[PDB]
Amino acid sequence: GAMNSSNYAELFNNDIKLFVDDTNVYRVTVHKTFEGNVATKAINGCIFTLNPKTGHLFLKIIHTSVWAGQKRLSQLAKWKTAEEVSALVRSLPKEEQPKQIIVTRKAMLDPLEVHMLDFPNIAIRPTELRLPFSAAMSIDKLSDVVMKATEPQMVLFNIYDDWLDRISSYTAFSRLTLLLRALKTNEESAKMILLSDPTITIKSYHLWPSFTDEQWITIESQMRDLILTEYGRKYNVNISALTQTEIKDIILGQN
Amino acid sequence: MNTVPFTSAPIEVTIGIDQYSFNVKENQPFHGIKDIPIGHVHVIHFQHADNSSMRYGYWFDCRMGNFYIQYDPKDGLYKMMEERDGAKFENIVHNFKERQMMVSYPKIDEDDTWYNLTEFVQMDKIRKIVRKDENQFSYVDSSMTTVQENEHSLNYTVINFKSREAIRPGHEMEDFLDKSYYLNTVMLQGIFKNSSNYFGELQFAFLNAMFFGNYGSSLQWHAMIELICSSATVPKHMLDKLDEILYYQIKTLPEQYSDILLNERVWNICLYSSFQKNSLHNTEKIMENKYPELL
């Protein structure tokens, strides 16, 4: 699984690398046109590009103007993502450019390889982990900045808040993935956990609440419980029977 | 019809000529091959008893000269040579009169198969790939690799669908999804100059894969097929010709080698997914009849 994957271990070496998730690029609301058929209406989307080492999230907001006059949007979205990711990389100083880009969906490989031909030293690879990055719009400050956009724009976030002052990148990425996996599993339950104590505030400049080290342990335990009970119902298994490597496989989404 | 005499045959050998083959045993008298349709290109090839030794041979054109075979005890190979003096060659051809023991190239009154397999293969196409030397004929063997394999070389035009050459900057999606720019501007207009040269290399790739077992040649053949089919815009005369070219290749392919000479991915794309799938009418028909396991 993930815990015996040399690939997974590599995320936390000293190479610069970026995850790209394109799941939220093309988003719609569902309607009906005069012919009675299904009608879709694009709403703003985003590219989730993350440095798992620093927590820096380059959130490219995909304003609905970029679909105007275009067709086959579900195919185009992947090519647009690739276009933007490559533009990002071009914008960066050389020693800040990633040695590797990991796409969450294999359908991104051809479009990104083609767009990155000017960077032959940047390796594009898929992952066998089903990472929960699509749940990114369950984070209110991300959802809000995307929906309020009136034009294409890039917004930088640190998705680890101030955690790296106290824990390692591995621990912060594991925390991030746990939170997103919980929000993906059931957003209401996951929010009830995060927001149960309103005296622990989400700072204006943060995405997550200001838990103490002590409090994060409890929160992480509750998130784990939520995720594993859903898996447990899905397969009719007691949580307590799951091994630690199994739990990580569940959380990271090992194929 | 022409003759390729042998001035000696001192060593056992299995000999191929175009699609035919025969054995010459230890101490068997043998003076060559006659009744060869003049045509415009042929291959003669050789295999000795050690299965581990290479198959080697020569592509040649009877129209260009008087060619013959002679064993060379120095390199230990049958070699092709040219006789520029017509009278000396005539003497070689008629040496020994009724005592001549020769193979007759089968009559092909309605087996235009060899013509169809080599329609666009002329010696200049071959020399592009197998570097020209002092001879009017071109040596090839089963140990040769392509420059692409390398990354005695087969210098095919490199086709790479994910390369700057295939993709104009700013046309990424356009050029990856529709290969027309790459086929028409880069390959046909830029490199091959015309479709006959393109088809010639495609046919030679097939023949080398079939005769000398070179996997890189099979890769090149498939890539040149895929390039055409994955282009929305192809000159109509190419489109109409491609189906016939492939039809005879599939027809002639040794069925024992079909597993390693035929790429499932490329054929399913070309026949069922590509822009030009409807232009492969007979090729689809022969594939379905002869190799249904590939579809």
Side-chain angles (χ1 to χ4, degrees):
Chain A
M3 314 306 297
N4 293 291
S5 165
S6 64
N7 272 0
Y8 182 61
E10 192 176 8
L11 293 169
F12 312 105
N13 73 13
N14 290 333
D15 281 349
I16 298 180
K17 61 209 83 74
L18 298 176
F19 272 116
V20 164
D21 178 270
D22 66 309
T23 59
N24 288 317
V25 163
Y26 176 45
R27 296 201 301 153
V28 297
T29 51
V30 187
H31 311 270
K32 271 186 183 180
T33 332
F34 57 3
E35 297 206 305
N37 274 327
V38 181
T40 60
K41 196 182 302 195
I43 65 183
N44 296 342
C46 60
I47 307 170
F48 184 98
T49 300
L50 171 73
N51 180 334
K53 187 114 157 166
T54 58
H56 293 148
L57 165 66
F58 299 88
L59 192 72
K60 174 58 188 215
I61 298 172
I62 302 294
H63 184 255
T64 65
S65 63
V66 316
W67 311 129
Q70 297 279 15
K71 289 140 155 285
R72 290 163 300 282
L73 300 187
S74 285
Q75 167 181 64
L76 182 64
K78 302 183 178 56
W79 290 91
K80 174 67 176 172
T81 303
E83 177 186 346
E84 291 299 336
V85 169
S86 53
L88 174 56
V89 172
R90 297 169 195 285
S91 77
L92 299 175
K94 174 167 57 64
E95 60 287 311
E96 204 181 312
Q97 300 177 331
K99 317 296 188 313
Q100 172 176 221
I101 302 174
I102 300 98
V103 299
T104 56
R105 314 205 289 174
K106 288 178 201 269
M108 278 303 305
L109 292 169
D110 286 349
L112 188 63
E113 286 176 42
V114 168
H115 272 275
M116 299 292 285
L117 291 168
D118 290 338
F119 306 92
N121 294 316
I122 307 181
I124 311 314
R125 81 158 168 91
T127 178
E128 297 299 328
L129 311 168
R130 300 168 185 160
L131 289 162
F133 297 148
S134 71
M137 298 292 96
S138 278
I139 300 167
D140 290 356
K141 296 185 191 208
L142 305 192
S143 180
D144 283 352
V145 75
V146 165
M147 292 305 295
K148 289 175 176 163
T150 71
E151 73 196 286
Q153 57 193 264
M154 162 78 105
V155 184
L156 282 3
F157 288 96
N158 184 344
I159 209 174
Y160 296 162
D161 291 347
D162 60 356
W163 309 339
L164 297 176
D165 304 340
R166 315 182 295 285
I167 68 182
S168 80
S169 296
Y170 174 90
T171 304
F173 185 78
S174 298
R175 182 178 293 163
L176 171 69
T177 60
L178 186 76
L179 289 161
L180 293 169
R181 173 69 62 201
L183 289 157
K184 197 166 185 170
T185 301
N186 186 286
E187 187 190 279
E188 295 75 39
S189 297
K191 286 171 178 173
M192 291 180 66
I193 293 163
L194 284 166
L195 269 32
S196 78
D197 195 337
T199 75
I200 305 162
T201 70
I202 303 181
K203 296 303 168 292
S204 76
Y205 45 74
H206 278 165
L207 298 181
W208 312 103
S210 303
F211 296 118
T212 62
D213 296 347
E214 200 167 280
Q215 289 168 342
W216 268 123
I217 293 318
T218 294
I219 293 287
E220 289 172 344
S221 177
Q222 299 174 303
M223 294 297 182
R224 190 168 310 111
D225 170 271
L226 182 175
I227 294 158
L228 301 179
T229 68
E230 158 72 30
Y231 173 97
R233 290 169 184 158
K234 194 186 327 179
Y235 291 85
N236 297 83
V237 206
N238 192 342
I239 285 188
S240 57
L242 298 181
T243 63
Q244 174 82 6
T245 73
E246 276 180 296
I247 295 175
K248 304 312 300 321
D249 279 344
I250 292 166
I251 298 164
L252 296 162
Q254 182 74 60
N255 266 282
Chain B
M1 272 166 300
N2 278 14
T3 295
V4 178
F6 277 49
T7 55
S8 66
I11 299 291
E12 63 83 32
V13 71
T14 293
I15 300 170
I17 179 86
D18 301 343
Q19 67 266 69
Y20 303 104
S21 65
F22 60 91
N23 298 323
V24 178
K25 300 188 227 270
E26 255 116 24
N27 315 318
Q28 174 184 345
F30 179 70
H31 306 101
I33 306 164
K34 70 186 202 147
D35 296 338
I36 305 180
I38 302 232
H40 62 263
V41 83
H42 303 277
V43 66
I44 181 165
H45 60 79
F46 302 90
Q47 172 73 51
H48 301 283
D50 188 345
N51 299 346
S52 171
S53 70
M54 67 185 174
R55 177 131 105 189
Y56 61 96
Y58 307 83
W59 289 93
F60 63 103
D61 176 2
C62 297
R63 299 173 306 169
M64 303 182 64
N66 300 316
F67 304 105
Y68 65 105
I69 298 300
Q70 182 168 304
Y71 192 66
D72 167 31
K74 291 174 287 196
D75 291 340
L77 293 173
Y78 282 100
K79 298 198 174 165
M80 177 163 289
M81 312 186 67
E82 184 182 353
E83 181 47 70
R84 277 247 108 103
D85 186 316
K88 180 171 175 187
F89 186 75
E90 283 301 291
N91 272 9
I92 297 294
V93 168
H94 306 297
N95 259 347
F96 319 136
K97 301 192 163 61
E98 73 260 35
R99 298 192 177 241
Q100 271 179 3
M101 295 289 183
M102 294 215 179
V103 151
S104 293
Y105 193 106
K107 167 51 66 180
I108 50 174
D109 237 278
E110 199 15 82
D111 187 87
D112 223 14
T113 294
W114 186 250
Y115 171 81
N116 286 114
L117 285 175
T118 60
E119 177 177 353
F120 297 102
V121 181
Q122 277 76 47
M123 289 303 305
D124 67 319
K125 285 81 177 176
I126 296 185
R127 290 160 186 153
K128 158 153 139 49
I129 297 169
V130 181
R131 285 1 206 83
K132 229 297 183 162
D133 50 28
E134 346 89 66
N135 309 305
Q136 288 195 108
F137 49 89
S138 297
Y139 172 89
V140 175
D141 70 42
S142 56
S143 85
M144 284 179 179
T145 55
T146 77
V147 175
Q148 214 164 2
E149 267 171 329
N150 293 350
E151 283 213 337
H152 291 280
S153 244
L154 304 171
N155 191 19
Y156 292 113
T157 292
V158 171
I159 292 173
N160 178 3
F161 298 128
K162 296 168 176 177
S163 68
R164 178 48 70 212
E165 290 72 25
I167 308 290
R168 295 168 292 179
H171 294 269
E172 285 73 13
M173 185 176 179
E174 178 187 350
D175 282 347
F176 189 71
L177 294 189
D178 173 7
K179 313 284 183 197
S180 289
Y181 160 74
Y182 194 28
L183 172 64
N184 290 293
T185 290
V186 182
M187 290 292 160
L188 288 178
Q189 293 163 41
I191 302 175
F192 290 96
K193 302 306 172 190
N194 61 63
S195 54
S196 298
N197 298 330
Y198 187 97
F199 280 148
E201 177 154 326
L202 180 163
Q203 281 177 323
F204 186 73
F206 174 76
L207 291 160
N208 196 61
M210 180 175 68
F211 282 122
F212 298 90
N214 172 235
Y215 190 61
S217 294
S218 183
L219 257 37
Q220 180 75 18
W221 177 56
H222 287 95
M224 298 186 82
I225 295 169
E226 169 163 18
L227 176 57
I228 294 169
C229 292
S230 301
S231 301
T233 312
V234 175
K236 197 83 228 292
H237 73 272
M238 285 200 49
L239 269 186
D240 281 296
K241 189 74 220 176
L242 180 66
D243 183 37
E244 303 168 28
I245 285 169
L246 303 181
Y247 180 88
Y248 275 89
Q249 297 171 331
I250 304 305
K251 181 164 118 72
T252 311
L253 211 159
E255 5 194 351
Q256 307 80 10
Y257 306 174
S258 66
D259 50 334
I260 44 87
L261 293 180
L262 285 184
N263 181 284
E264 177 165 339
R265 176 195 72 82
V266 179
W267 289 103
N268 281 275
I269 286 169
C270 294
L271 295 176
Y272 307 120
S273 302
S274 73
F275 288 105
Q276 310 300 340
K277 56 173 162 263
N278 296 324
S279 279
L280 299 180
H281 176 272
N282 296 276
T283 299
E284 132 104 49
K285 180 130 251 77
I286 189 168
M287 280 289 265
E288 190 157 36
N289 202 32
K290 187 159 211 181
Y291 299 115
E293 69 276 14
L294 279 315
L295 303 324

mmCIF file of all heavy atoms in Angstrom, chain A residues 47-75:
data_model
loop_
_atom_site.group_PDB
_atom_site.id
_atom_site.type_symbol
_atom_site.label_atom_id
_atom_site.label_comp_id
_atom_site.label_asym_id
_atom_site.label_seq_id
_atom_site.Cartn_x
_atom_site.Cartn_y
_atom_site.Cartn_z
ATOM 1 N N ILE A 47 -8.165 25.235 -10.272
ATOM 2 C CA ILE A 47 -7.104 24.243 -10.302
ATOM 3 C C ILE A 47 -6.439 24.191 -8.934
ATOM 4 O O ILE A 47 -6.030 25.217 -8.393
ATOM 5 C CB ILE A 47 -6.007 24.591 -11.327
ATOM 6 C CG1 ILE A 47 -6.609 24.841 -12.707
ATOM 7 C CG2 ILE A 47 -4.935 23.453 -11.362
ATOM 8 C CD1 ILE A 47 -5.619 25.416 -13.721
ATOM 9 N N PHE A 48 -6.311 22.982 -8.395
ATOM 10 C CA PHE A 48 -5.696 22.771 -7.090
ATOM 11 C C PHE A 48 -4.254 22.301 -7.348
ATOM 12 O O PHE A 48 -4.027 21.166 -7.745
ATOM 13 C CB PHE A 48 -6.524 21.719 -6.345
ATOM 14 C CG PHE A 48 -6.076 21.442 -4.930
ATOM 15 C CD1 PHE A 48 -6.704 22.056 -3.849
ATOM 16 C CD2 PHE A 48 -5.072 20.517 -4.683
ATOM 17 C CE1 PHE A 48 -6.309 21.779 -2.533
ATOM 18 C CE2 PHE A 48 -4.672 20.230 -3.385
ATOM 19 C CZ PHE A 48 -5.296 20.856 -2.302
ATOM 20 N N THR A 49 -3.303 23.212 -7.196
ATOM 21 C CA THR A 49 -1.887 22.899 -7.357
ATOM 22 C C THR A 49 -1.170 23.116 -6.021
ATOM 23 O O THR A 49 -1.113 24.245 -5.512
ATOM 24 C CB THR A 49 -1.253 23.771 -8.452
ATOM 25 O OG1 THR A 49 -1.936 23.518 -9.695
ATOM 26 C CG2 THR A 49 0.229 23.444 -8.597
ATOM 27 N N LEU A 50 -0.618 22.037 -5.463
ATOM 28 C CA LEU A 50 -0.139 22.064 -4.095
ATOM 29 C C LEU A 50 1.290 21.580 -3.982
ATOM 30 O O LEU A 50 1.650 20.569 -4.568
ATOM 31 C CB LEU A 50 -1.018 21.151 -3.242
ATOM 32 C CG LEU A 50 -0.537 20.898 -1.812
ATOM 33 C CD1 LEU A 50 -0.739 22.121 -0.941
ATOM 34 C CD2 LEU A 50 -1.227 19.680 -1.220
ATOM 35 N N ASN A 51 2.098 22.306 -3.220
ATOM 36 C CA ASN A 51 3.403 21.823 -2.820
ATOM 37 C C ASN A 51 3.251 21.135 -1.459
ATOM 38 O O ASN A 51 3.044 21.788 -0.429
ATOM 39 C CB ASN A 51 4.404 22.994 -2.789
ATOM 40 C CG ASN A 51 5.800 22.563 -2.384
ATOM 41 O OD1 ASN A 51 5.974 21.568 -1.681
ATOM 42 N ND2 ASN A 51 6.805 23.313 -2.827
ATOM 43 N N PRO A 52 3.314 19.791 -1.447
ATOM 44 C CA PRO A 52 2.995 19.060 -0.217
ATOM 45 C C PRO A 52 4.053 19.282 0.860
ATOM 46 O O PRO A 52 3.829 18.975 2.038
ATOM 47 C CB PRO A 52 2.956 17.596 -0.677
ATOM 48 C CG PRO A 52 3.881 17.553 -1.892
ATOM 49 C CD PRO A 52 3.683 18.901 -2.566
ATOM 50 N N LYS A 53 5.199 19.828 0.456
ATOM 51 C CA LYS A 53 6.261 20.100 1.409
ATOM 52 C C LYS A 53 6.068 21.428 2.173
ATOM 53 O O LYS A 53 6.320 21.506 3.374
ATOM 54 C CB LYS A 53 7.607 20.059 0.697
ATOM 55 C CG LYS A 53 8.773 20.155 1.609
ATOM 56 C CD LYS A 53 9.587 18.881 1.600
ATOM 57 C CE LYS A 53 11.008 19.181 2.053
ATOM 58 N NZ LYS A 53 11.780 17.950 2.380
ATOM 59 N N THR A 54 5.610 22.459 1.474
ATOM 60 C CA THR A 54 5.492 23.778 2.067
ATOM 61 C C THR A 54 4.049 24.081 2.450
ATOM 62 O O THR A 54 3.798 24.971 3.262
ATOM 63 C CB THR A 54 5.960 24.861 1.084
ATOM 64 O OG1 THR A 54 5.181 24.778 -0.112
ATOM 65 C CG2 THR A 54 7.436 24.659 0.732
ATOM 66 N N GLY A 55 3.105 23.361 1.844
ATOM 67 C CA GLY A 55 1.690 23.662 2.011
ATOM 68 C C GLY A 55 1.185 24.767 1.097
ATOM 69 O O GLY A 55 0.012 25.162 1.169
ATOM 70 N N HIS A 56 2.060 25.297 0.243
ATOM 71 C CA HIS A 56 1.640 26.369 -0.654
ATOM 72 C C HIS A 56 0.670 25.813 -1.683
ATOM 73 O O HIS A 56 0.950 24.801 -2.354
ATOM 74 C CB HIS A 56 2.836 27.066 -1.344
ATOM 75 C CG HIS A 56 3.702 27.828 -0.400
ATOM 76 N ND1 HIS A 56 5.056 27.977 -0.584
ATOM 77 C CD2 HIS A 56 3.411 28.452 0.763
ATOM 78 C CE1 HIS A 56 5.563 28.659 0.426
ATOM 79 N NE2 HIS A 56 4.586 28.964 1.255
ATOM 80 N N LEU A 57 -0.476 26.479 -1.798
ATOM 81 C CA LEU A 57 -1.513 26.102 -2.741
ATOM 82 C C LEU A 57 -1.682 27.229 -3.748
ATOM 83 O O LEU A 57 -2.047 28.344 -3.379
ATOM 84 C CB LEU A 57 -2.838 25.888 -2.023
ATOM 85 C CG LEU A 57 -4.098 25.829 -2.868
ATOM 86 C CD1 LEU A 57 -4.096 24.600 -3.771
ATOM 87 C CD2 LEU A 57 -5.333 25.826 -1.978
ATOM 88 N N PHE A 58 -1.385 26.932 -5.009
ATOM 89 C CA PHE A 58 -1.540 27.903 -6.066
ATOM 90 C C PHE A 58 -2.925 27.688 -6.636
ATOM 91 O O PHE A 58 -3.138 26.836 -7.490
ATOM 92 C CB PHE A 58 -0.457 27.684 -7.120
ATOM 93 C CG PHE A 58 0.930 27.839 -6.590
ATOM 94 C CD1 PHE A 58 1.602 26.761 -6.029
ATOM 95 C CD2 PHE A 58 1.578 29.062 -6.663
ATOM 96 C CE1 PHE A 58 2.880 26.903 -5.526
ATOM 97 C CE2 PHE A 58 2.882 29.203 -6.171
ATOM 98 C CZ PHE A 58 3.521 28.119 -5.592
ATOM 99 N N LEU A 59 -3.888 28.437 -6.125
ATOM 100 C CA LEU A 59 -5.279 28.216 -6.515
ATOM 101 C C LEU A 59 -5.592 29.079 -7.725
ATOM 102 O O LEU A 59 -5.855 30.276 -7.585
ATOM 103 C CB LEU A 59 -6.249 28.538 -5.357
ATOM 104 C CG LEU A 59 -7.698 28.066 -5.549
ATOM 105 C CD1 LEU A 59 -7.765 26.535 -5.428
ATOM 106 C CD2 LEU A 59 -8.670 28.748 -4.568
ATOM 107 N N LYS A 60 -5.534 28.474 -8.910
ATOM 108 C CA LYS A 60 -5.915 29.168 -10.135
ATOM 109 C C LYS A 60 -7.434 29.144 -10.254
ATOM 110 O O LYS A 60 -8.044 28.097 -10.432
ATOM 111 C CB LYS A 60 -5.261 28.530 -11.366
ATOM 112 C CG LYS A 60 -5.752 29.154 -12.692
ATOM 113 C CD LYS A 60 -5.493 30.654 -12.745
ATOM 114 C CE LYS A 60 -6.162 31.293 -13.971
ATOM 115 N NZ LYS A 60 -5.320 32.394 -14.510
ATOM 116 N N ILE A 61 -8.065 30.301 -10.136
ATOM 117 C CA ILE A 61 -9.515 30.327 -10.260
ATOM 118 C C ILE A 61 -9.911 30.320 -11.732
ATOM 119 O O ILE A 61 -9.430 31.135 -12.515
ATOM 120 C CB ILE A 61 -10.122 31.548 -9.554
ATOM 121 C CG1 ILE A 61 -9.796 31.470 -8.049
ATOM 122 C CG2 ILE A 61 -11.605 31.567 -9.771
ATOM 123 C CD1 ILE A 61 -10.172 32.704 -7.215
ATOM 124 N N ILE A 62 -10.790 29.395 -12.084
ATOM 125 C CA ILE A 62 -11.238 29.232 -13.451
ATOM 126 C C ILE A 62 -12.577 29.960 -13.586
ATOM 127 O O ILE A 62 -13.632 29.434 -13.238
ATOM 128 C CB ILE A 62 -11.344 27.745 -13.841
ATOM 129 C CG1 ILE A 62 -9.982 27.050 -13.661
ATOM 130 C CG2 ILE A 62 -11.832 27.599 -15.289
ATOM 131 C CD1 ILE A 62 -8.853 27.561 -14.625
ATOM 132 N N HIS A 63 -12.510 31.200 -14.047
ATOM 133 C CA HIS A 63 -13.722 31.997 -14.208
ATOM 134 C C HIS A 63 -14.495 31.470 -15.422
ATOM 135 O O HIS A 63 -13.887 31.021 -16.401
ATOM 136 C CB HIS A 63 -13.354 33.464 -14.394
ATOM 137 C CG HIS A 63 -14.535 34.368 -14.483
ATOM 138 N ND1 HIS A 63 -14.963 34.918 -15.672
ATOM 139 C CD2 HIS A 63 -15.403 34.792 -13.537
ATOM 140 C CE1 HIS A 63 -16.036 35.659 -15.451
ATOM 141 N NE2 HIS A 63 -16.322 35.601 -14.163
ATOM 142 N N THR A 64 -15.825 31.515 -15.375
ATOM 143 C CA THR A 64 -16.624 30.951 -16.463
ATOM 144 C C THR A 64 -16.433 31.628 -17.808
ATOM 145 O O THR A 64 -16.757 31.038 -18.839
ATOM 146 C CB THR A 64 -18.117 30.908 -16.144
ATOM 147 O OG1 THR A 64 -18.609 32.247 -16.016
ATOM 148 C CG2 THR A 64 -18.344 30.144 -14.828
ATOM 149 N N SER A 65 -15.855 32.823 -17.824
ATOM 150 C CA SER A 65 -15.482 33.425 -19.114
ATOM 151 C C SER A 65 -14.543 32.547 -19.957
ATOM 152 O O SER A 65 -14.530 32.647 -21.184
ATOM 153 C CB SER A 65 -14.831 34.799 -18.916
ATOM 154 O OG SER A 65 -13.620 34.676 -18.179
ATOM 155 N N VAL A 66 -13.749 31.691 -19.326
ATOM 156 C CA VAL A 66 -12.800 30.908 -20.118
ATOM 157 C C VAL A 66 -13.479 29.781 -20.910
ATOM 158 O O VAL A 66 -12.876 29.191 -21.795
ATOM 159 C CB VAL A 66 -11.612 30.373 -19.288
ATOM 160 C CG1 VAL A 66 -11.077 31.459 -18.360
ATOM 161 C CG2 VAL A 66 -12.019 29.135 -18.509
ATOM 162 N N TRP A 67 -14.735 29.491 -20.601
ATOM 163 C CA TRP A 67 -15.492 28.569 -21.418
ATOM 164 C C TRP A 67 -16.263 29.237 -22.575
ATOM 165 O O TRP A 67 -16.823 28.553 -23.411
ATOM 166 C CB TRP A 67 -16.492 27.800 -20.549
ATOM 167 C CG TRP A 67 -15.921 27.192 -19.292
ATOM 168 C CD1 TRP A 67 -16.419 27.323 -18.018
ATOM 169 C CD2 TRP A 67 -14.782 26.329 -19.191
ATOM 170 N NE1 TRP A 67 -15.648 26.613 -17.133
ATOM 171 C CE2 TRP A 67 -14.641 25.984 -17.823
ATOM 172 C CE3 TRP A 67 -13.865 25.813 -20.127
ATOM 173 C CZ2 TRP A 67 -13.616 25.149 -17.358
ATOM 174 C CZ3 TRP A 67 -12.844 24.981 -19.667
ATOM 175 C CH2 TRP A 67 -12.729 24.661 -18.286
ATOM 176 N N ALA A 68 -16.316 30.561 -22.605
ATOM 177 C CA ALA A 68 -17.165 31.253 -23.563
ATOM 178 C C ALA A 68 -16.710 30.984 -25.010
ATOM 179 O O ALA A 68 -15.510 31.060 -25.318
ATOM 180 C CB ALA A 68 -17.187 32.761 -23.253
ATOM 181 N N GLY A 69 -17.655 30.617 -25.877
ATOM 182 C CA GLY A 69 -17.333 30.352 -27.266
ATOM 183 C C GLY A 69 -16.597 29.026 -27.464
ATOM 184 O O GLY A 69 -16.129 28.730 -28.566
ATOM 185 N N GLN A 70 -16.489 28.229 -26.406
ATOM 186 C CA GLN A 70 -15.821 26.922 -26.491
ATOM 187 C C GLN A 70 -16.843 25.795 -26.475
ATOM 188 O O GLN A 70 -17.975 25.995 -26.059
ATOM 189 C CB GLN A 70 -14.844 26.718 -25.331
ATOM 190 C CG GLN A 70 -13.680 27.698 -25.266
ATOM 191 C CD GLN A 70 -12.553 27.318 -26.216
ATOM 192 O OE1 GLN A 70 -12.731 26.503 -27.111
ATOM 193 N NE2 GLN A 70 -11.387 27.906 -26.014
ATOM 194 N N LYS A 71 -16.420 24.613 -26.913
ATOM 195 C CA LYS A 71 -17.259 23.418 -26.936
ATOM 196 C C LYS A 71 -16.533 22.255 -26.251
ATOM 197 O O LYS A 71 -15.337 22.344 -25.964
ATOM 198 C CB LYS A 71 -17.537 23.013 -28.388
ATOM 199 C CG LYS A 71 -18.483 23.925 -29.153
ATOM 200 C CD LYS A 71 -17.988 24.115 -30.578
ATOM 201 C CE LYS A 71 -19.122 24.478 -31.519
ATOM 202 N NZ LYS A 71 -19.979 23.297 -31.822
ATOM 203 N N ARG A 72 -17.251 21.156 -26.034
ATOM 204 C CA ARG A 72 -16.697 19.956 -25.386
ATOM 205 C C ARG A 72 -15.891 20.276 -24.131
ATOM 206 O O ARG A 72 -14.726 19.881 -23.991
ATOM 207 C CB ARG A 72 -15.858 19.147 -26.373
ATOM 208 C CG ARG A 72 -16.693 18.465 -27.435
ATOM 209 C CD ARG A 72 -15.841 18.014 -28.617
ATOM 210 N NE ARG A 72 -15.150 19.130 -29.268
ATOM 211 C CZ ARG A 72 -15.729 19.992 -30.106
ATOM 212 N NH1 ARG A 72 -17.022 19.885 -30.397
ATOM 213 N NH2 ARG A 72 -15.017 20.973 -30.652
ATOM 214 N N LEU A 73 -16.533 20.983 -23.211
ATOM 215 C CA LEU A 73 -15.856 21.502 -22.034
ATOM 216 C C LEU A 73 -15.204 20.417 -21.152
ATOM 217 O O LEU A 73 -14.175 20.646 -20.528
ATOM 218 C CB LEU A 73 -16.845 22.332 -21.210
ATOM 219 C CG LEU A 73 -17.425 23.532 -21.958
ATOM 220 C CD1 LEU A 73 -18.278 24.426 -21.025
ATOM 221 C CD2 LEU A 73 -16.328 24.352 -22.639
ATOM 222 N N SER A 74 -15.801 19.237 -21.105
ATOM 223 C CA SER A 74 -15.270 18.181 -20.248
ATOM 224 C C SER A 74 -13.926 17.660 -20.741
ATOM 225 O O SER A 74 -13.124 17.144 -19.959
ATOM 226 C CB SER A 74 -16.259 17.028 -20.146
ATOM 227 O OG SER A 74 -17.324 17.392 -19.299
ATOM 228 N N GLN A 75 -13.696 17.791 -22.038
ATOM 229 C CA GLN A 75 -12.427 17.417 -22.629
ATOM 230 C C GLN A 75 -11.483 18.608 -22.512
ATOM 231 O O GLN A 75 -10.329 18.473 -22.083
ATOM 232 C CB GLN A 75 -12.629 16.990 -24.082
ATOM 233 C CG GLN A 75 -11.332 16.875 -24.882
ATOM 234 C CD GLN A 75 -11.559 16.463 -26.336
ATOM 235 O OE1 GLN A 75 -12.173 17.189 -27.119
ATOM 236 N NE2 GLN A 75 -11.050 15.295 -26.698
#
